[PDB]
Amino acid sequence: GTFGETKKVRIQCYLQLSVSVEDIFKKDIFFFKFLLNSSVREEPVILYSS
Amino acid sequence: DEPKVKVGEIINLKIITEPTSTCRRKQNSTVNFLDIVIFDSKTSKILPRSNRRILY
Protein backbone atom coordinates (compact mmCIF):
# COMPACT_ATOMS: atom_id res chain seq x y z
CA GLY A 1 0.00 0.00 0.00
CA THR A 2 2.14 2.84 -1.33
CA PHE A 3 0.73 5.79 0.61
CA GLY A 4 2.33 9.02 -0.61
CA GLU A 5 -0.27 10.98 1.34
CA THR A 6 -0.07 14.34 3.15
CA LYS A 7 2.26 16.04 0.66
CA LYS A 8 1.13 19.40 2.06
CA VAL A 9 1.97 21.58 -0.93
CA ARG A 10 1.03 25.26 -1.04
CA ILE A 11 0.19 26.66 -4.47
CA GLN A 12 0.01 30.30 -5.51
CA CYS A 13 -2.65 32.06 -7.57
CA TYR A 14 -1.21 35.28 -8.98
CA LEU A 15 -0.78 35.68 -12.74
CA GLN A 16 2.59 37.39 -12.85
CA LEU A 17 2.45 39.12 -16.23
CA SER A 18 -0.04 41.87 -17.02
CA VAL A 19 -1.08 43.02 -20.49
CA SER A 20 -2.71 46.34 -21.42
CA VAL A 21 -4.28 46.76 -24.87
CA GLU A 22 -4.51 49.87 -27.05
CA ASP A 23 -6.16 49.78 -30.48
CA ILE A 24 -4.72 52.44 -32.77
CA PHE A 25 -7.16 53.21 -35.56
CA LYS A 26 -5.79 53.92 -39.01
CA LYS A 27 -7.09 54.14 -42.57
CA ASP A 28 -7.10 50.60 -44.12
CA ILE A 29 -4.39 49.32 -41.70
CA PHE A 30 -4.44 48.68 -37.99
CA PHE A 31 -2.11 48.75 -35.00
CA PHE A 32 -2.02 47.08 -31.61
CA LYS A 33 -0.09 48.59 -28.71
CA PHE A 34 0.67 46.31 -25.79
CA LEU A 35 1.93 47.43 -22.38
CA LEU A 36 3.40 44.44 -20.56
CA ASN A 37 4.55 44.53 -16.95
CA SER A 38 4.72 42.50 -13.76
CA SER A 39 1.88 41.80 -11.37
CA VAL A 40 3.43 43.25 -8.21
CA ARG A 41 6.27 45.75 -7.89
CA GLU A 42 8.98 43.54 -6.37
CA GLU A 43 8.81 40.40 -8.57
CA PRO A 44 10.30 41.07 -12.01
CA VAL A 45 9.48 38.99 -15.06
CA ILE A 46 11.59 37.77 -17.97
CA LEU A 47 9.90 37.42 -21.36
CA TYR A 48 10.87 35.14 -24.25
CA SER A 49 8.35 35.53 -27.09
CA SER A 50 5.09 37.27 -27.98
CA ASP B 1 19.21 51.30 -43.97
CA GLU B 2 17.26 52.95 -46.88
CA PRO B 3 16.01 56.25 -45.36
CA LYS B 4 13.06 56.54 -47.80
CA VAL B 5 10.41 54.57 -45.90
CA LYS B 6 6.82 54.95 -47.02
CA VAL B 7 4.54 53.85 -44.13
CA GLY B 8 4.56 50.12 -43.55
CA GLU B 9 8.16 48.97 -43.26
CA ILE B 10 9.20 47.50 -39.94
CA ILE B 11 12.90 48.27 -40.30
CA ASN B 12 15.69 47.37 -37.90
CA LEU B 13 18.06 50.09 -36.70
CA LYS B 14 21.68 49.03 -36.19
CA ILE B 15 23.86 50.34 -33.36
CA ILE B 16 27.57 49.53 -33.10
CA THR B 17 29.05 50.34 -29.69
CA GLU B 18 32.72 50.36 -28.76
CA PRO B 19 34.10 51.45 -25.38
CA THR B 20 37.00 53.84 -25.56
CA SER B 21 40.42 54.07 -23.88
CA THR B 22 38.56 55.13 -20.71
CA CYS B 23 37.42 51.51 -20.35
CA ARG B 24 40.06 51.35 -17.60
CA ARG B 25 38.28 53.89 -15.41
CA LYS B 26 35.23 52.59 -13.62
CA GLN B 27 34.96 48.76 -13.97
CA ASN B 28 32.79 48.21 -10.86
CA SER B 29 29.71 48.87 -12.88
CA THR B 30 29.77 46.18 -15.53
CA VAL B 31 26.51 47.29 -17.19
CA ASN B 32 25.49 50.69 -18.55
CA PHE B 33 22.12 51.67 -19.98
CA LEU B 34 21.37 53.08 -23.41
CA ASP B 35 18.23 55.18 -23.83
CA ILE B 36 17.37 55.60 -27.50
CA VAL B 37 15.58 58.91 -27.82
CA ILE B 38 13.36 60.13 -30.59
CA PHE B 39 13.30 63.67 -31.96
CA ASP B 40 11.16 65.28 -34.59
CA SER B 41 13.07 66.96 -37.40
CA LYS B 42 11.45 70.33 -36.75
CA THR B 43 10.02 70.19 -33.23
CA SER B 44 11.48 68.27 -30.24
CA LYS B 45 10.71 65.69 -27.49
CA ILE B 46 8.39 63.03 -28.87
CA LEU B 47 6.80 61.28 -25.87
CA PRO B 48 7.82 57.60 -25.57
CA ARG B 49 4.34 56.09 -25.94
CA SER B 50 4.63 57.57 -29.43
CA ASN B 51 1.33 57.02 -31.21
CA ARG B 52 0.88 58.30 -34.82
CA ARG B 53 4.68 58.12 -34.80
CA ILE B 54 7.40 55.49 -34.61
CA LEU B 55 6.24 52.37 -32.86
CA TYR B 56 8.99 50.16 -31.50
Phi, psi of B21 (to 5 degrees): -75, -5
Among the partner residues B7, B8, B51, nearest to A24 by beta-carbon distance: B51
Q: What experimental approach yielded this model?
A: cryo-EM
Cα separation, B25 vs A40, in Å, equals 37
The residue of chain B nearest to residue A32, with distances taken between CA atoms, is B55
* CA A23 to each of CA A36, B20, B31: distance values in angstroms, whole numbers, following the listed order: 15, 44, 35
Compute the distance between CA of residue B5 and CA of residue B9 in angstroms, rounded to an integer: 7
- Reported resolution, Å: 4.3
Determine contact: A33 vs chain B, CB below 8 A: yes
Rounded to whole angstroms, the Cα distance separating A4 from A12 reads 22
